[PDB]
Design an enzyme around this catalytic site. Structure first.
Site, short mmCIF file in Angstrom:
data_model
loop_
_atom_site.label_atom_id
_atom_site.label_comp_id
_atom_site.label_asym_id
_atom_site.label_seq_id
_atom_site.Cartn_x
_atom_site.Cartn_y
_atom_site.Cartn_z
N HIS A 61 0.82 -1.23 0.00
CA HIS A 61 0.00 0.00 0.00
C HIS A 61 0.84 1.27 0.00
O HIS A 61 0.43 2.30 -0.53
CB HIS A 61 -0.93 0.03 1.22
CG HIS A 61 -1.78 -1.20 1.35
ND1 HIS A 61 -2.75 -1.53 0.44
CD2 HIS A 61 -1.79 -2.17 2.30
CE1 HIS A 61 -3.34 -2.65 0.82
NE2 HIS A 61 -2.77 -3.07 1.93
N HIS A 91 5.67 7.01 6.46
CA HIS A 91 5.41 6.58 5.10
C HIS A 91 4.89 7.77 4.33
O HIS A 91 4.69 8.83 4.91
CB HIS A 91 4.37 5.46 5.08
CG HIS A 91 3.07 5.86 5.69
ND1 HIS A 91 2.80 5.74 7.04
CD2 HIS A 91 1.98 6.45 5.14
CE1 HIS A 91 1.59 6.22 7.28
NE2 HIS A 91 1.08 6.66 6.15
N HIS A 93 2.14 9.09 0.90
CA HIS A 93 1.12 8.86 -0.12
C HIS A 93 1.48 9.77 -1.28
O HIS A 93 1.90 10.90 -1.06
CB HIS A 93 -0.28 9.19 0.41
CG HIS A 93 -0.62 8.47 1.67
ND1 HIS A 93 -1.38 7.33 1.69
CD2 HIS A 93 -0.25 8.70 2.96
CE1 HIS A 93 -1.50 6.90 2.94
NE2 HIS A 93 -0.82 7.71 3.72
N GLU A 103 -3.25 13.49 0.65
CA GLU A 103 -4.52 13.06 1.21
C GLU A 103 -5.28 14.28 1.74
O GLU A 103 -6.39 14.56 1.31
CB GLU A 103 -4.28 12.01 2.29
CG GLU A 103 -3.52 10.81 1.76
CD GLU A 103 -3.83 9.55 2.51
OE1 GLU A 103 -3.48 9.46 3.69
OE2 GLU A 103 -4.43 8.64 1.92
N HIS A 116 3.59 11.04 6.33
CA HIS A 116 2.94 10.77 7.61
C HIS A 116 3.93 10.15 8.58
O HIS A 116 4.42 9.05 8.34
CB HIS A 116 1.75 9.81 7.42
CG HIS A 116 0.61 10.44 6.69
ND1 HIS A 116 -0.38 9.71 6.06
CD2 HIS A 116 0.31 11.74 6.49
CE1 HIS A 116 -1.25 10.55 5.51
NE2 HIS A 116 -0.85 11.78 5.75
N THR A 195 -6.13 6.79 7.54
CA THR A 195 -6.65 7.08 6.20
C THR A 195 -6.69 5.84 5.31
O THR A 195 -7.05 5.94 4.14
CB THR A 195 -5.81 8.14 5.48
OG1 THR A 195 -4.50 7.61 5.24
CG2 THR A 195 -5.72 9.44 6.29
N1 LIG Z 1 -2.16 6.91 6.66
S1 LIG Z 1 -2.19 6.85 8.26
O1 LIG Z 1 -0.99 7.47 8.74
O2 LIG Z 1 -3.45 7.37 8.69
C1 LIG Z 1 -2.14 5.15 8.74
C2 LIG Z 1 -1.31 4.73 9.78
C3 LIG Z 1 -1.37 3.41 10.21
C4 LIG Z 1 -2.26 2.50 9.63
C5 LIG Z 1 -2.43 1.12 10.17
C6 LIG Z 1 -2.56 0.89 11.53
C7 LIG Z 1 -2.84 -0.38 11.99
C8 LIG Z 1 -2.98 -1.40 11.07
N2 LIG Z 1 -2.86 -1.22 9.75
C9 LIG Z 1 -2.59 0.02 9.33
C10 LIG Z 1 -3.05 2.94 8.58
C11 LIG Z 1 -3.00 4.25 8.13
ZN LIG Z 2 -0.63 7.67 5.78
#
Ligand SMILES: NS(=O)(=O)c1ccc(-c2cccnc2)cc1
Ligand SMILES: [Zn+2]
Ligand SMILES: NS(=O)(=O)c1ccc(-c2cccnc2)cc1
Length: 257
Positions: A61, A91, A93, A103, A116, A195
Site C-alpha cells: 500500500h 510513510h 502517499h 490526502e 505521515h 486514512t
Molecule cells: N495513513 S495513516 O498514517 O493514517 C495510517 C497509519 C497506520 C495504519 C495502520 C494501523 C494499523 C494497522 N494497519 C494500518 C493505517 C493508516
Molecule cells: Zn498515511
C-alpha cells in the site's frame, strides 16, 4: 483485498470497514479561512535526536520506514497533545502526476505527496492497543511539492529499488527523520482517523502548514514501486491516497495567526 484500484479503492472500503462513513474520518480539506487560530495551542515538540530506524518495508500500500519504539527515543509532545507519543514509522502517499497525491488538501489544493510520521500514545503501552483509543495516535502530516530536491529524503529514495514489490523489506538503520521536516512547525490540528483500512478513529492529526520541496527525480522514484508482489503482473504504486472526507461536526484549529 482493499487497495486503490477501480475495484478495491476508497469507494469500496465501506463494505468491509463500515467506519469509512463515520463521524471523524480522514483525510479532510483544510479550509484555511474557516480554521480558527487557537492561542492556547502549544508549540509542537518534535524530539527525534535519539531516533533508531530499523527497516524499510513495502507493504503493498506504501512503504514504511520503521523505528524502534520500545523506548522513548523519538517522541512527539506538546501542540494539541496530552502526554508523550512515540514514533513508530513514517510513510508517504503520492500521485501518478505532480498535481495529485496528497490526502489532506489545503483550500482544495492537492500536493504531489504527503508524509505521515506516525506516533502512538505511550499511556496505552503499544501500538495495537493505541489504535483502539480516540486519542491513541498522533500523525504528523507534511506536504510535498515538486521543486528543489530534499537532501534528507535521498537515502530513502535510493533504497527503493531493493523493496520494489509487496512484502520486500531491507535494513534501514541510522536514518535521521529530522531531515524530512520543513523550517516552520506551524500547524493545523483536528480529530480524525487512519486514512487506510481499518480506518480507526484514533488519530489526532497535526498537519504542517509549510510543505517540503522534493525533486521531480525523487518523486519519480516513488512511482517506480509496485503494489504487486514479485512474479505478479506489474502495477505501479501510484495514487495511493484517499480523497477528502466530510468534515461533519469538527473544527480545524490553527497554531498560527
Ligand atoms: N495513513 S495513516 O498514517 O493514517 C495510517 C497509519 C497506520 C495504519 C495502520 C494501523 C494499523 C494497522 N494497519 C494500518 C493505517 C493508516
Ligand atoms: Zn498515511
Ligand atoms: N475495499 S474492500 O476491503 O471493501 C474490498 C475487498 C476485496 C475486494 C475484492 C475485489 C475483487 C476480488 N475480490 C475481492 C473488493 C473490495
Amino acid at each position: 483485498h482493499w487497495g486503490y484500484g477501480k475495484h478495491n479503492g476508497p469507494e469500496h472500503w465501506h463494505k468491509d470497514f463500515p467506519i469509512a462513513k463515520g463521524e471523524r474520518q480522514s483525510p479532510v480539506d483544510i479550509d484555511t479561512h474557516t480554521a480558527k487560530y487557537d492561542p492556547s495551542l502549544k508549540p509542537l515538540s518534535v524530539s527525534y535526536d535519539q531516533a533508531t530506524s530499523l527497516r524499510i518495508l513495502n507493504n503493498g500500500h506504501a512503504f514504511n520506514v520503521e523505528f524502534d519504539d520500545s523506548q522513548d527515543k523519538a517522541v512527539l509532545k506538546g501542540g494539541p497533545l496530552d502526554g508523550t507519543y512515540r514514533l513508530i514509522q513514517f510513510h508517504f502517499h503520492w500521485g501518478s502526476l505532480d498535481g495529485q497525491g496528497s490526502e489532506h488538501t489545503v483550500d482544495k489544493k492537492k500536493y504531489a505527496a504527503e508524509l505521515h510520521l506516525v506516533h502512538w500514545n505511550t499511556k496505552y503501552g503499544d501500538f495495537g492497543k493505541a489504535v483502539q483509543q480516540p486519542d491513541g495516535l498522533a500523525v504528523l502530516g507534511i506536504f510535498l511539492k515538486v521543486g528543489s530536491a530534499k537532501p534528507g529524503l535521498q537515502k530513502v529514495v535510493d533504497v527503493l529499488d531493493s523493496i520494489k514489490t509487496k512484502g520486500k523489506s531491507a535494513d534501514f538503520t541510522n536514518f535521521d527523520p529530522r531531515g524530512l521536516l520543513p523550517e516552520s512547525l506551524d500547524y493545523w490540528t483536528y480529530p480524525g482517523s487512519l486514512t487506510t483500512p481499518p480506518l480507526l478513529e484514533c488519530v489526532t492529526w497535526i498537519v504542517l502548514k509549510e510543505p517540503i520541496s522534493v525533486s521531480s527525480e525523487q518523486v519519480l522514484k516513488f512511482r517506480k514501486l509496485n503494489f504487486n508482489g514479485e512474479g505478479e503482473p506489474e502495477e505501479l504504486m501510484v495514487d495511493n491516497w484517499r480523497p477528502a472526507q466530510p468534515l461533519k461536526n469538527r473544527q480545524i484549529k490553527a497554531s498560527f495567526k
